[PDB]
Write a protein that binds this ligand. Structure first.
Ligand SMILES: *C(=C)C1=C(C)[C@@H](Cc2[nH]c(/C=C3N=C(/C=C4\NC(=O)[C@H](C)[C@H]4CC)C(C)=C\3CCC(=O)O)c(CCC(=O)O)c2C)NC1=O
Ligand SMILES: *CCC1=C(C)C(=O)N[C@H]1Cc1[nH]c(/C=C2\N=C(C[C@H]3NC(=O)C(CC)=C3C)C(C)=C2CCC(=O)O)c(CCC(=O)O)c1C
Ligand SMILES: C=CC1=C(C)[C@@H](Cc2[nH]c(/C=C3N=C(/C=C4\NC(=O)[C@H](C)[C@H]4CC)C(C)=C\3CCC(=O)O)c(CCC(=O)O)c2C)NC1=O
Ligand SMILES: C=CC1=C(C)[C@@H](Cc2[nH]c(/C=C3N=C(/C=C4\NC(=O)[C@H](C)[C@H]4CC)C(C)=C\3CCC(=O)O)c(CCC(=O)O)c2C)NC1=O
Ligand SMILES: C=CC1=C(C)[C@@H](Cc2[nH]c(/C=C3N=C(/C=C4\NC(=O)[C@H](C)[C@H]4CC)C(C)=C\3CCC(=O)O)c(CCC(=O)O)c2C)NC1=O
Ligand SMILES: C=CC1=C(C)[C@@H](Cc2[nH]c(/C=C3N=C(/C=C4\NC(=O)[C@H](C)[C@H]4CC)C(C)=C\3CCC(=O)O)c(CCC(=O)O)c2C)NC1=O
Ligand SMILES: C=CC1=C(C)[C@@H](Cc2[nH]c(/C=C3N=C(/C=C4\NC(=O)[C@H](C)[C@H]4CC)C(C)=C\3CCC(=O)O)c(CCC(=O)O)c2C)NC1=O
Ligand SMILES: C=CC1=C(C)[C@@H](Cc2[nH]c(/C=C3N=C(/C=C4\NC(=O)[C@H](C)[C@H]4CC)C(C)=C\3CCC(=O)O)c(CCC(=O)O)c2C)NC1=O
Ligand SMILES: C=CC1=C(C)[C@@H](Cc2[nH]c(/C=C3N=C(/C=C4\NC(=O)[C@H](C)[C@H]4CC)C(C)=C\3CCC(=O)O)c(CCC(=O)O)c2C)NC1=O
Ligand SMILES: C=CC1=C(C)[C@@H](Cc2[nH]c(/C=C3N=C(/C=C4\NC(=O)[C@H](C)[C@H]4CC)C(C)=C\3CCC(=O)O)c(CCC(=O)O)c2C)NC1=O
Ligand SMILES: C=CC1=C(C)[C@@H](Cc2[nH]c(/C=C3N=C(/C=C4\NC(=O)[C@H](C)[C@H]4CC)C(C)=C\3CCC(=O)O)c(CCC(=O)O)c2C)NC1=O
Ligand SMILES: C=CC1=C(C)[C@@H](Cc2[nH]c(/C=C3N=C(/C=C4\NC(=O)[C@H](C)[C@H]4CC)C(C)=C\3CCC(=O)O)c(CCC(=O)O)c2C)NC1=O
Ligand SMILES: C=CC1=C(C)[C@@H](Cc2[nH]c(/C=C3N=C(/C=C4\NC(=O)[C@H](C)[C@H]4CC)C(C)=C\3CCC(=O)O)c(CCC(=O)O)c2C)NC1=O
Ligand SMILES: CCC1=C(C)[C@@H](CC2=N/C(=C\c3[nH]c(C[C@@H]4NC(=O)C(C)=C4CC)c(C)c3CCC(=O)O)C(CCC(=O)O)=C2C)NC1=O
Lengths: 164, 250, 34, 177, 164, 177, 164, 177
């Protein structure tokens, strides 16, 4: 996983160097920013019931054609697997808020997605519709704090930019 | 005896460059001819200092044999010089792709900022440093020995991916991956490479152990942006020794 | 060179691996006990 | 490779659990004494050059058979290689202490090291002793109990990081055994 | 372009060999099959006015959501550029019927399509809908002959498989 | 490559001067507004995916000759390579704005780019326009004046960082010219 | 120069990635630690005439044999060039306190030193004697603050470890 | 296993040749000094008990690192194993000298011994020295040139059998190397 830790000690390992003052100095920011980026972690972890619920129907409200026969969400179990994917992506965003980098996203949701979504006819626009609907519904003093909300939206739009 | 003055072309090599005129344009082309000779000196140096590791003590090591049969070294020149002729038959897409591909990899193995600035300014120097870096630490495929048949298949998969970029997007074979130039020269190449395959198994117990860790480090430094790729590099070093720089077609 | 799977004629890399020499320690250790 | 933060993420990914408030008491305590972790790593990397020549020379005055003719540290080349893999092991242990997790230690340094030292004929008894002297130097430098170098620190307790690096060193020793 | 010719002389050039009897024997099939595969070429070339017309509205009839604002076919010039793409793909199929291989398709429609269609939000399912609608409307004695229809459908489904 | 801190170090090394108190007023002002530079870089890398398809499609809408038969953006392969360019240049400009110095821009991206685009036959006039539209998007995203996306920020002035990234973009444009 | 900045954007450039949250988080420690590591910079810059003076005679007090004929410091101009080297090394430590990493040291004092000091018969022990004499004479509340003293001593011992 | 007589039989069986009169000059000379061969083997097996404790103690006063703590001959169990190991090599060398052929030496003693001593961590330098001291004792006992034991013999020359057992001992040494 790419984080603040695993970046600076692989740059040191590739050069064969001991951890210098830059390597220690990089982890000092992992002390300051982790008060903000971890506050969104339990906020998403405790209320993950309703965010997946509110994103999944917004995806089908933007694209009502998916429930037609021959399409991706034609029957019930396909919609059940569709809500499971938004739950998976929100779990990976919860993980990335905890590591402090885009490690778990890039390993478990991003790498190889552009092959399986084209092979199984899953439209990526309907994937980014739910993530964008989660993105604009962030009441910055009500959902979480200000810093937290910035750290949450910066991981949502990274997934949006990577899926498109 | 006639009276023959020096011709004008015999006098146009004594001129002084003037930038305000069109005579700047001829000292354009007079200078990159010298700045390619600079590159062919730079690459010649960086080849030789790495090549001095195959003879560390004054005695020729078995890494740089060329000639197991009576005429095997004389055909090796005809292999290499024809490959060098076909290297500059590539179009402007491939040469400019390979230059900027080599600038992504020379810039991560250079230690000081001047050494990275040198690979930046001179592209043949950056082509030669990547070669000399894989020769002194034997992470090439011509020295990589798999250990189990597991890892042999694991290296075969990566090599099958690498051969696919040796053809066009249509499926036509590109002129880079070619194994013959004349009648019977492909059979000479086949006899020439099996001797190198036998010489790679004759290393010492120290050299096998050194190149194991060097291949794992080469795999996890240059071709690993993720955790699963470096997990493959840490367990199967011969799989990691089959990833080319992609400046090569083959 | 290329592995034996694609575009390759005869079998290669006849070199002693650590498992094979482990078996050669083991057979001698059994023979001494017998 | 992993660190202390991602270690609980692969533990939660094994059950598809969100990282909840139970899991974050171990990690918010990792942040509270993070300055002690940086102050502990800085004390080791400051005297890392003395630590190898300290430990390898201690391993020599243990056993003069290494500098004996035919011995494993008999040549200048072999002595330089032994001083080289003293430093590599000290480098990866300081990586693992900085990361708070032993993962980078045992897939980049110790994975495949035992059969390497068996194939080279490197004697494992002295390899254990060269690591144990470096471990004893590490607990002295973290707890500020070296004989002739004291470093300036803010007052407080540091036996937890000392026990962590002591836990990394016998992982190294059990790996090379 | 990958064809019957350019395959067998690059295999000979890579080995440094003169054209052997296999190289001559491969071009003998290019004499037999070119009576069938060229008969579909002028059939598609003369009646390309109506095939693009009949595929373009079938694409929008399967997916009526594309004319919504914010989508790919929201205004008139976007639909004009959409019909131009089906004309481009039918022109490349006409070329591939003439060379005898998938050369011009792989060079001019296939390579790099999966990047531009994801970057510009063009849904690939709506691309393969028109090609499939062309594929099932092949009256095998009425549009062309039997083998010309086989050669035409084999190039249509190659584009279908490559786009998905 | 260099950054804003090392830039004054090579300036002082040219005269063997110590970095004194005169030199540190420029750098302590670099640190004071360090939060605004991170907040400015975060706004660009958030909408970097829209910025390339915004700019390249704007470059198309102005010159239909690129998608003309034989044109430089006529093939899917050529359109993917042009979109690949729109992203490399945006990546190196965001490196240079983060570093506070234009050094990593013009030895890793622009050094040798002009004769590459001359040798490829890439139109220079069309290029300039793809960079200028991205520059116009950068000043809109830094000063929070985009039409349909507003980002949350602490209140204050940011025209200095906007002028800095505008100074990097015409460096790119003068390099490819 | 290796610093906190140039490490995290070359790790991003080698992977072809935009600056992620780890890249921003690493520079946050460059905000906290730069209050301490810059406080030693003007302290060394303003009093850089007494430190070179106090290190140079300590070097010759440890090694009085250097003033013998045939040795390195036999005449006056060689001692003048010897004090210039300690001034150079303290200037590089002053630079490294400003960048925040071991960049200028590794470029200008470390790389290639082990060749010139062996070729010109300069004993490296006499080089590290002056740096060690600077190191143990750090009165931690009197010379500077506590953390500025830590940051200063960590760069002095890095040069000590690199020269030996 | 083979002996001196069967050695020429496998050489003749490789070409389907009868053993003729050319081949029997080497074997009828093997019979003429057979009494010297028995007299040479009897001198070695008489002092074989002194030879191991002679050679292993010489190998110790070579190198005190073997009896060092952690050393390979440090324990009573390890010293007994080493003493027992020294008696096995002297036994098989006396088999090979009695048989007149080195065949029983290198399929029953030396086949697989190298890997064994590598896997055990037995140091090969001292293994060479323990064999070379036994070789030096063998040439002294065959040529009747020991310092403090002389044995009764009929007068004559015996350097051929001494050279044969010297040829067996470096076969042992090159095998364990
Ligand atoms: C063709 C003739 C033509 C276009 C295609 C279109 C492109 C264009 N857009 C601008 C100005 C901006 N472009 C922006 C990029 C985006 N806007 C967004 O909100 C998202 C995040 C992203 C793409 C998905 C931005 C932010 C601006 C600034 C203003 C704003 O608030 O949007 C230009 C340059 C100036 C202009 O011509 O308007 C171009 C060419 N416009 C076309 O004319
Ligand atoms: C690397 C280039 C490549 C790609 C990609 C590919 O698919 N095939 C190669 C090129 C190629 N080579 C041949 C024919 C021959 N190649 C050899 C050399 C190989 N044989 C060997 O023994 C060794 C090393 C030990 C090698 C590399 C030989 C002897 C031939 C046959 C020569 C002949 O006269 O027939 C071909 C033709 C098709 C084929 O694979 O045989 C191609 C495309
Ligand atoms: C760890 C990360 C992770 C993911 C992101 C998903 C991704 C994913 N989705 C599906 C599979 C599917 N995914 C969807 C989802 C959707 N279809 C739509 O039209 C919408 C865009 C979306 C719902 C909102 C559907 C409908 C299927 C069934 C398709 C099929 O069975 O062929 C599959 C195939 C195996 C399976 O059925 O699970 C995979 C790997 N799974 C993962 O393990
Ligand atoms: C200032 C110094 C100076 C010189 C040294 C000469 C040399 C010289 N010779 C030629 C030109 C020539 N030079 C030669 C000479 C020879 N060809 C051969 O085979 C022989 C080896 C050699 C004669 C011994 C010939 C044959 C030409 C004519 C080429 C032609 O007409 O195509 C030219 C080009 C101008 C022209 O076409 O006349 C020059 C510069 N002239 C000078 O002004
Ligand atoms: C001083 C340093 C030093 C070296 C580098 C080697 C240099 C070297 N290279 C090759 C020969 C070669 N070397 C390579 C290089 C490689 N092979 C790969 O698959 C990798 C991409 C790459 C390792 C990084 C290739 C592809 C050839 C074959 C070229 C040919 O035979 O025409 C040969 C002999 C065979 C020949 O040329 O025909 C020698 C001696 N020796 C030295 O003494
Ligand atoms: C990535 C992880 C990594 C390591 C841990 C090291 C360890 C290591 N050391 C050696 C190689 C060696 N290692 C030693 C070390 C020792 N012998 C002793 O008796 C002591 C117990 C110990 C020193 C304290 C010696 C003496 C050699 C040289 C053997 C020889 O030259 O024959 C080798 C084989 C390569 C070579 O020959 O140099 C390796 C992999 N290197 C690495 O790349
Ligand atoms: C028989 C051979 C033999 C040696 C060569 C020395 C080496 C040596 N030193 C230590 C023990 C130690 N070794 C060091 C290392 C160092 N101490 C410093 O002050 C420097 C910074 C650095 C080398 C320059 C440290 C810090 C300790 C802990 C105690 C202390 O020195 O305060 C130990 C382990 C415990 C012990 O035995 O004391 C050994 C074997 N001692 C020996 O018995
Ligand atoms: C970039 C480089 C960098 C570092 C090197 C550290 C530097 C550092 N260490 C501590 C601070 C400390 N360090 C220690 C550690 C110890 N004290 C002892 O008496 C033991 C010998 C040793 C145990 C290992 C303790 C106990 C504190 C105070 C408690 C704490 O701050 O957590 C502090 C907080 C107090 C302060 O200085 O403001 C800082 C900044 N942090 C950094 O950002
Ligand atoms: C030689 C082969 C070749 C192609 C296949 C096309 C592919 C292609 N289409 C578009 C561009 C486009 N392509 C479409 C087409 C469609 N949108 C849909 O929803 C449907 C799937 C489809 C119509 C049926 C639209 C609507 C645009 C405009 C998108 C935009 O301008 O951003 C572009 C960008 C430049 C341009 O506007 O032309 C390219 C390269 N062009 C080519 O040169
Ligand atoms: C390290 C820095 C770095 C870059 C800046 C890029 C730039 C770049 N682009 C291309 C290659 C290309 N670049 C373009 C781009 C364009 N043509 C246009 O008409 C537009 C003005 C513009 C897009 C906006 C096109 C169309 C090609 C393909 C040319 C071809 O395929 O013939 C090449 C040659 C390699 C190749 O063929 O792919 C390079 C080096 N790549 C890099 O590695
Ligand atoms: C690790 C990730 C990371 C970041 C993304 C930034 C996040 C960030 N930005 C600002 C803070 C700020 N950011 C801005 C910037 C702007 N305001 C505007 O109205 C303009 C649109 C825009 C100009 C570009 C301003 C004006 C402040 C407050 C002044 C300041 O703190 O310097 C602050 C300080 C206030 C606070 O939140 O406590 C922080 C932490 N820092 C980080 O450590
Ligand atoms: C930027 C970094 C930088 C340095 C570190 C020095 C390093 C350095 N010193 C000397 C050159 C010298 N350096 C010394 C210094 C010493 N001799 C001793 O015994 C002591 C160890 C020490 C004084 C305390 C002397 C005496 C010479 C003269 C040697 C000679 O002229 O041959 C030279 C040769 C050119 C010259 O005369 O300057 C260089 C490159 N110079 C640099 O530019
Ligand atoms: C440093 C430690 C050390 C020792 C322990 C002794 C052991 C020893 N003895 C011999 C040399 C010998 N060792 C013996 C063995 C024996 N002699 C007898 O008379 C007995 C029958 C039997 C043991 C009871 C014999 C026969 C010789 C040859 C010379 C002789 O003794 O006449 C050698 C080899 C040549 C030599 O060095 O002399 C050694 C190492 N010498 C040493 O230098
Ligand atoms: C560019 C295509 C090309 C080559 C490569 C060489 C290949 C080559 N090497 C040779 C000969 C040769 N080859 C080597 C080995 C090799 N050479 C070195 O300089 C080092 C450092 C090596 C690896 C250790 C040595 C050491 C010799 C000298 C033998 C001698 O002089 O007796 C010979 C002479 C053979 C002969 O005389 O019979 C040739 C043709 N020639 C070419 O046209």
């Amino acid at each position: 996983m790419k984080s603040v830790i695993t970046t600076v000690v692989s740059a040191a390992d590739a050069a064969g160097r001991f951890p210098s003052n830059s390597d220690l100095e990089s982890i000092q920011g992992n002390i300051q920013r982790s008060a903000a980026r971890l506050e969104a972690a339990e906020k998403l972890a405790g209320n993950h019931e309703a965010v997946v619920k509110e994103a999944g129907d917004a995806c089908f409200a933007k694209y009502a054609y998916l429930k037609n026969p021959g399409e991706a969400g034609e029957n019930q179990e396909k919609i059940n697997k569709c809500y499971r994917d938004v739950d998976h992506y929100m779990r990976l965003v919860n993980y990335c808020l905890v590591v402090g980098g885009t490690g778990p996203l890039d390993e478990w949701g991003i790498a190889g997605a552009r092959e399986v979504y084209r092979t199984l006819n899953l439209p990526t626009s309907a994937y980014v519709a739910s993530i964008a609907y989660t993105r604009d519904r962030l009441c910055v003093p009500r959902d979480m704090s200000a810093q937290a909300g910035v750290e949450f939206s910066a991981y949502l739009d990274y997934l949006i930019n990577a899926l498109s | 005896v006639t009276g023959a003055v020096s011709s004008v072309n015999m006098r146009r090599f004594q001129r002084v460059p003037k930038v305000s005129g069109f005579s700047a344009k001829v000292t354009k082309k007079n200078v990159n001819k010298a700045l390619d000779k600079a590159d062919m000196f730079f690459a010649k140096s960086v080849t030789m200092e790495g090549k001095a590791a195959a003879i560390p003590y004054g005695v020729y090591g078995i890494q740089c044999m060329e000639g197991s049969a009576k005429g095997m070294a004389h055909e090796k020149r005809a292999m290499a010089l024809s490959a060098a002729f076909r290297m500059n038959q590539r179009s402007a897409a491939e040469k400019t792709g390979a230059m900027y591909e080599n600038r992504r990899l020379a810039l991560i193995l250079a230690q000081n900022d001047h050494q990275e600035k040198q690979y930046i300014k001179y592209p043949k120097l950056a082509a030669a440093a990547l070669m000399a870096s894989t020769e002194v630490t034997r992470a090439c495929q011509r020295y990589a020995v798999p250990e189990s048949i597991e890892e042999e298949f694991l290296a075969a998969s990566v090599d099958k991916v690498n051969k696919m970029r040796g053809t066009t997007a249509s499926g036509v074979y590109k002129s880079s991956c070619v194994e013959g130039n004349a009648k019977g020269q492909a059979e000479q190449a086949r006899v020439a490479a099996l001797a190198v395959a036998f010489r790679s198994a004759q290393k010492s117990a120290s050299q096998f152990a050194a190149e194991r860790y060097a291949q794992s480090k080469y795999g996890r430094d240059l071709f690993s942006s993720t955790h699963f790729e470096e997990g493959y590099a840490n367990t199967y070093p011969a799989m990691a020794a089959a990833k080319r720089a992609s400046s090569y077609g083959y | 060179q290329t592995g034996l799977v694609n575009s390759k004629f005869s079998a290669r890399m006849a070199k002693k691996t650590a498992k094979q020499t482990k078996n050669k320690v083991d057979e001698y250790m059994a023979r001494s006990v017998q | 490779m992993l660190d202390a933060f991602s270690r609980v993420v692969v533990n939660s990914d094994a059950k598809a659990a969100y990282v909840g408030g139970s899991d974050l008491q171990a990690l918010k305590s990792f942040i509270a004494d993070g300055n002690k972790r940086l102050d502990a790593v800085n004390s080791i990397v400051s005297n890392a050059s003395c630590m190898v020549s300290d430990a390898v020379s201690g391993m020599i005055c243990e056993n003069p058979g290494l500098i004996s003719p035919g011995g494993n540290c008999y040549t200048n080349r072999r002595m330089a290689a032994c001083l080289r893999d003293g430093e590599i092991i000290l480098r990866y242990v300081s990586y693992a202490l900085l990361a708070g997790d032993a993962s980078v230690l045992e897939d980049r340094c110790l994975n495949g090291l035992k059969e390497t030292y068996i194939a080279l004929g490197v004697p494992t008894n002295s390899s254990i002793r060269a690591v144990s002297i470096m471990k004893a130097q590490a607990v002295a430098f973290i707890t500020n109990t070296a004989t002739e170098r004291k470093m300036s620190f803010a007052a407080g307790d540091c036996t937890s990081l000392a026990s962590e690096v002591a836990s990394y060193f016998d992982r190294v020793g059990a790996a090379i055994s």
